[PDB]
Write a protein that binds this ligand. Sequence first.
Ligand SMILES: Nc1ncnc2c1ncn2[C@@H]1O[C@H](COP(=O)(O)OP(=O)(O)O)[C@@H](O)[C@H]1O
Ligand code: BEF
Ligand SMILES: [Mg+2]
Length: 719
Amino acid sequence: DPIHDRTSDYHKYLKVKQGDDKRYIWYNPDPKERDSYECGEIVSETSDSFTFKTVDGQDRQVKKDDANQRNPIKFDGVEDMSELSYLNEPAVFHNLRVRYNQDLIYTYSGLFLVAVNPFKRIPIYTQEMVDIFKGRRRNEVAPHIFAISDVAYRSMLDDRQNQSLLITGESGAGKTENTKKVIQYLASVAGRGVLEQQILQANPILEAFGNAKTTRNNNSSRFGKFIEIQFNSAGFISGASIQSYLLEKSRVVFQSETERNYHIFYQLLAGATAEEKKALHLAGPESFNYLNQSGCVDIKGVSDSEEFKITRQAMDIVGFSQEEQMSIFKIIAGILHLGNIKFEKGAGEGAVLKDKTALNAASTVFGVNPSVLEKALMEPRILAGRDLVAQHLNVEKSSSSRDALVKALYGRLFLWLVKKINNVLCEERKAYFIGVLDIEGFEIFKVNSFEQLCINYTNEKLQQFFNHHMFKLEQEEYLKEKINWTFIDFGLDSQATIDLIDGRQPPGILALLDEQSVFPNATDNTLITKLHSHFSKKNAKYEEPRFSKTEFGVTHYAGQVMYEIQDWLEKNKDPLQQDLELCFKDSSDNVVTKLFNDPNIASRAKFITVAAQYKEQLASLMATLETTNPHFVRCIIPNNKQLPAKLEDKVVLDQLRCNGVLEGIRITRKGFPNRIIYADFVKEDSQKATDAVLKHLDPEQFRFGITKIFFRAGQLARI
Ligand SMILES: Nc1ncnc2c1ncn2[C@@H]1O[C@H](COP(=O)(O)OP(=O)(O)O)[C@@H](O)[C@H]1O
Ligand code: BEF
Ligand SMILES: [Mg+2]
């Protein structure tokens, strides 16, 4: 029994090792750097302040309700931060750091599982590790993604209720790795198996087409996902379903320095056989504009040819036909060829295509007519007035249209891959489900565009959902034992920002964006002007900048975010010339044809803008989450260098402020956080027996209940 054998890998890798007076505080040696603390010993006090000795042996003073008291050393490495007497920033970080120093990357903080990326392998995900967590309560085993997974599974079986695990945090923090562990765990504890294996193999497929090397993560997820693992009433896996969100289609046509395009492009060019290579007119990455601009074509530690074998293997297991696999690769190759089309200026303003090589190669692989494609690109017919007239586009517009075609192809293909996978995995009458959400947390970059607003909008709703969940839990517990606290549902605090974004009346940002989009005469400038007209000095969550004419600020839960408006109209309409649509609807390829003829893939439904679709999909997601018992995982990146053993105070503390753990862990401290059953406290009339152990020593520090005794912050600690 590894849990009781101190020599087990369990004890070594998941527990603080077990063998056979004065007060301190955390202070800043430099008051400008609020996150760099040292430990100072308190030596004296007045009533409104402390005096402590710094490391450089000095004497300073600070107010009492400003002091960051250090918890007693015995608490260093505690598994649940709910046990800490003090929950100030430095204290919370200190406990995370003591654990991290011991390669203990998982820690609870109330409802949250906090997971700090180790950036090295830690052997805690083997089958033996899996077996240990089966059936164990959270407080019976060490913190681990497997423990939250198990707790969810048992809750599903015991309560006959659907569950969700929300795994968030910034890019590179560990969301996807932890999501994969959840799926591994469920697969093992609830599996047989062909199905289990098909479920596991869906991942590699999606990651090949949806992930890419960015500066923050060698394997960054460029789309969000909600994975529904389905179970029959006996508790065995019966199916799965995947919903994808906000695929970064722009990456296909542009990548920042040192970043890569999606993995699949490199897998194909490196793993294709001689036959395929000549048959798809392939070459090295350096010969494709869509792959030769960033300066990076490889990832240290990754073999694209090997990965390609893994990808094909996953495709076989899931059941993609050889013909379907070939067509998928034809689409990937065609996109690269489209990227190599060089438009040049003609006699007039109209672009021309001198060399037909890439056009023909693309047209050959896609199975479309090159003459029809060339015209669709350079001379699309537009409905001007009552006349349908072919317009001759210049180099810029021709290039942009080509890029639009590429993004539409990649986006539609990804959607098709997801639906194909769902066709194999989905139940179709499932009894219960455990849903896993793997999406980015709040994003605040140097430049924030429409995609950031969308993700921040999602996070506002998820944060509100968390706060409302807490309110309900506490309200129920208090109203159960009858115990007068009036607390406010902090979820209400999120409504103003949410309304600013998605409100109908008065119209919010998305509604104004839609209004500017589906009617003529609008530009980025008319759009930003309208937003200012509606919200500047009129909505408390909005800010018109002092100088910029193209940005606006929104006060989000995690801070103000400044958005730039460039291209929002285009992003919201996501246009593709009808002649291009017509061009590809005639494709001879079996997959290409679905991408343009199946309305479930070719069209947003009845149009609707991108913002409206996003709003609807998020509302559907929230409605599903509301029917579940939720579990929360906060992934934390230790630094911005992808290095192990380097837990950077500033980097970590910022994430703790913006993800809700600092705020959340304190909410319970308002009122009576500790509640213990009478009989368990005394160890006849339990109530009186307790009234007597307490009276043997301030009644205001406690409020008896119907089954438990309620203590105020720190009181239980004193006893
Ligand atoms: N628990 C972990 N153990 C080992 N490596 C990890 C772990 N979690 C994160 N990784 C490392 O960090 C990288 C990024 O993690 P990932 O889950 O892709 O981040 P996100 O999905 O939050 O953008 C991984 O590819 C891996 O190298
Ligand atoms: F880059 Be991680 F997927 F957010
Ligand atoms: Mg990811």
